[PDB]
Amino acid sequence: VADGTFNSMIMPRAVIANEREHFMKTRIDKIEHDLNRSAKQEMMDRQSLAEDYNALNLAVGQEIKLDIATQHQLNRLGSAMYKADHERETELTDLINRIRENEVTVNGILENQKAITAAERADLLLEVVASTAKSVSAAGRAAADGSGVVPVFGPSVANGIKVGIDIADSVAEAAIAVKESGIITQLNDVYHAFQSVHVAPNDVIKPAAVVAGTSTELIGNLQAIYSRLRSHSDIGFKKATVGDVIPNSYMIKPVNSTEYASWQLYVIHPVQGSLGLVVQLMGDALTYNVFAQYGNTSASEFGKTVLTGGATNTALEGTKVKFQTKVTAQQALALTMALKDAASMLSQGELIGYFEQYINLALEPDNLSLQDNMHKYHHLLTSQNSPIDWNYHDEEMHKWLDSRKTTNYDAMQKKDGTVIADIHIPKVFNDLRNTTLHCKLEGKQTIAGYTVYEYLIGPWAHYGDIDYSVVVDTLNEETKWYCEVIGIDGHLLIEKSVQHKPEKILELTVNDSGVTSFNGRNHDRLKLKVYVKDSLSVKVFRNWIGINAPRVKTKMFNDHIGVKYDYSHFDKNISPAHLTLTDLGWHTWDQYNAGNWTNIK
């Protein structure tokens, strides 16, 4: 028997309603963002980035000037979001590689052991594949987190930027220069209500391996989940692009809450996603409604409802407490379904505490039955038999946002000049993967004095022509830096010596299916590795030949199963200090000897 004191000490706590519990969280996220990204560093490096972008030969109407305040603010938000998303894809590709190496042991684990929990199955799989990260708990994920994967903090980016510059009936060059230095009040409000979320491959493996019975199914589920996440992130950047103020999540609680008759209302507005969630907790009954963030022609923020789980009254009267979600709409829906099923055997405190902790801190509940049901529902919502047809909603969100961009610009072009509207609503900042962007690569591998910077080429959500370039800054006055692009048939080595200037390496064309033809073979992604002595910064730039390249349909489970691409060749490296002239070119693996990918032999 127990006194009951330990049970109350491990009960979940409300992290949204408690004002002490909201202040503490907000501080840590702000501290985490400032440590990894400093406002002083980004502002000081503005000039270097501006010259890099201009040095890329971009046709008129398709080039970006970071001399404009709005263009600069959009770029740092874009670069931070892209870097975190890009890092996750490299982690996923590595994880897929380890699973494919040990498919025999993975298949045995998926078949023999099915009575264990989702977390236990994931831990066994991670140990077998010998992945870099072997912890599925929340603390382990936080501990093994890179600098770039830290979510971007809205108010930190928008801090100390001039707002509301007024010039009256002036077309002079100086007045234009002072106008461009400031930013509009709308963009400041958007940045104050913006927070990003980037889920880890370790968090995704639990939904992926909860019903899988084969390694191919487990790999396909992982790819299918991450295809949805990247599409949602692309929507998130586009939302800030148009001239509209984004809605931000809030909780409604009674003004004077009673002990025995208390109700809570949660309205989740995921900035990275096409759908929102409304959850109501009255008594022991939980009711949810999934609405569409597009449309909303009326004053009400909610659009049409696409999934019903009861009657939710959003017109309740009470105090309003505001928060930013650290989970996607799929994850929030997955938990609210499991909570609804298990509402009978959980208390009021457990229901509120489990819900608030997951939405605000991405903390999975400690209940084992609750966790298993949550991941089973998460798999269903991201599979082909989902109650929500995602491809329809993400497509409709894209059309709605482009329509808003056109009417917002045309509304301004009437109120002020074309030049004023252009500097306030750029047309070159459409979508996260559509836009021209840069990736500040980091490197921790040194082979014979050469630092290795890795980069993942693709996958592509748009089709057309793409260009890739590198900018290398090195302390030495004269250096020789090499770029190696690895495919399936072989790798391509190039040598350059120019410094402090962008240089195009690869010209690539991608078709409707999102697959390029790299030297006679269909590829879905490539690996780019850069070797430099004593480098200080290496940046990779990407741009599409045409502005606003058309979209490529998102791939579901059956699309990933149909085509299989080998990624094992991304692991091998080369030693530039031992390179020779005859070894510099496009060569295949049958030319090289076993283990030495540096000399042709």
Partner 1 sequence: ANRATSAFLDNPHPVGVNYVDEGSRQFVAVAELLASKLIDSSRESDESNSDVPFVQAYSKFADDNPRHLRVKTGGKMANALTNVIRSYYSINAPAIVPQVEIDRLASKATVSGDMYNSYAIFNSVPIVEVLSPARTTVSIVGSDRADVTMLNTGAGAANITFNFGQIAETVILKGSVPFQLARLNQPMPAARFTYKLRPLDGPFIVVLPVGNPLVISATAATRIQVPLAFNKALVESGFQTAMNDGLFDIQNVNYYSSFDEFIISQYHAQDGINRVSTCVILGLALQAYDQMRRALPVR
Helix (H), strand (E) at residue 541:
strand 535-544
Nearer to a second copy, 385 or 580 (CB): 580
Q: Is 586:490 a contact under the CB 8 Å cutoff?
A: yes
Taken as a whole, the chain contains a residue count of 601
Could you tell me the smallest distance in angstroms from the CB atom of residue 281 to a second copy? 9
Cα angle: 125, vertex 131, 135; to 5 degrees? 70
Q: At residue 434, what is the residue type?
A: N
DSSP type of residue 577 = G
- Select from a second copy, partner 1, none the partner in contact with residue 385, using the beta carbon and a kind-dependent cut-off of 5 to 8 Å: none
* 188-215 burial code (b ≥16 CB/10 A, e <16): bebbebbbbbbbbbbbbbbbbbbbbeeb
Q: Considering only residues 258, 298, 344, 580, which one is a binding residue for partner 1 as defined by CB under 8 A?
A: 298
Which of partner 1, a second copy, none binds 477 (CB below 5-8 Å, type-dependent)?
none
Sign (positive/negative) of CA torsion 356, 359, 365, 370? positive
Picked from partner 1, a second copy, none, the partner binding residue 358 (CB below 5 to 8 A depending on kind) is none
Least Å from the CB of residue 8 to a second copy: 7
Footprint on residues 570-589 left by partner 1 (CB under 8 A): none
305's CB contacts (< 8 A; 6+ apart) are 289, 290, 291, 292
Give the one entry of partner 1, a second copy, none that residue 108 binds, where binding means its C-beta sits below a cut-off of 5 to 8 angstroms depending on kind: partner 1
For residue 35, the minimal CB distance to a second copy (Å) is 6
Where in 353-392 is the site for partner 1 (CB under 8 A)?
Answer: none
What, of a second copy, partner 1, none, does residue 577 touch, CB below 5 to 8 Å by kind? a second copy
- Residue 319 C-beta: closest distance to a second copy, Å: 7
Instruction: Tell me whether residue 360 is exposed, middle or buried, using C-beta atoms within 10 angstroms of its C-beta: 0 to 12, 13 to 18, 19 or more.
Output: buried
512 binds, among partner 1, a second copy, none (CB under 5 to 8 A by kind): none
**Least Å distance between CB 304 and partner 1?**
9
Q: How far apart are CA 241 and CA 425, in angstroms?
A: 7
Taking the complex as a whole, the smallest distance from the CB of residue 207 to a second copy amounts, in Å, to 19
Could you tell which of partner 1, a second copy, none binds residue 164, using a CB distance below 5 to 8 A set by kind? a second copy
**Among positions 7, 8, 297, 344, the unique one binding partner 1 when judged by CB under 8 A:** 297
Residue with tokens 């002239």: 581
Please say which residue, 175 or 211, places its beta carbon nearer to a second copy.
175
**Position 33: which residue type?**
H
Q: Could you say which residues in the range 116-155 bind partner 1, by CB under 8 A?
A: 116
**256 touches partner 1 by CB under 8 A:** no
Which residues are within 8 A (CB) of 20 and not within 5 positions of it... i.e. 6 or more apart?
A: none
Q: Least separation, in Å, of the C-beta of 297 and partner 1?
A: 5
Comparing CB distances to a second copy, the nearer of 288 and 597 is 597
Q: 173 vs 317, which CB is nearer to partner 1?
A: 317
Nearest distance from residue 172's CB to a second copy, in Å?
Answer: 5
Q: Which does 298 bind (CB under 5 to 8 A by kind): partner 1, a second copy, none?
A: partner 1
CB of 506 to a second copy, least distance (A): 23
Q: Whole-number minimum distance, CB 125 to partner 1, in Å? A: 15
Nearest to 64, CA basis, from 83, 78, 82: 78
Which CB sits closer to partner 1, 116 or 561?
116
| Partner in contact with 297, chosen from partner 1, a second copy, none, beta carbon below 5 to 8 Å by kind | partner 1
Contact indicator for 41, 394 with CB cutoff of 8 Å: no
Amino acid at 60: V
Minimum CB distance to a second copy, residue 7 (Å): 5
Give every CB contact of residue 600 below 8 A, 6+ residues apart in sequence.
582, 583, 587, 591, 592
> Strand, helix or coil at 153?
strand
* Spatial contact of 535 and 482, defined as CB atoms under 8 Å apart: no
DSSP type of residue 297: -
115 near partner 1 (CB under 8 A): yes
* Residue of 11, 26, 57, 108 that binds partner 1 (CB under 8 A): 108
- In the numeric block, which tokens belong to residue 193? 């209500």
In the list partner 1, a second copy, none, the entry touching 600 (Cβ below 5 to 8 angstroms by class) is: none
Instruction: Work out whether 8 is an interface residue with partner 1 (CB under 8 A).
Output: no
Range 314-326 burial, b when 16+ CB lie within 10 A, else e: eeeeeeebebbbb
CA distance 483 to 544: 21
Question: Which does residue 361 touch among partner 1, a second copy, none (CB within 5 to 8 A, set by kind)?
Answer: a second copy
Residue 23 or 299: which CB sits closer to a second copy?
Answer: 23
Residue 54's nearest CA partner among 501, 441, 430 is 501
Query: 432 near 82, Cβ under 8 Å?
Result: yes
**133 versus 211: smaller Cβ distance to a second copy:** 133
Cβ 238 to a second copy shortest distance, Å: 24
Cα–Cα distance, 112 to 325 (Å, whole number) = 37
Q: Residue 100 or 553: which CB sits closer to a second copy?
A: 100
Give the integer Cα–Cα distance in Å for 554 and 193: 28
**Binding interface with partner 1 (CB under 8 A):** 108, 112, 114-116, 297-298, 317
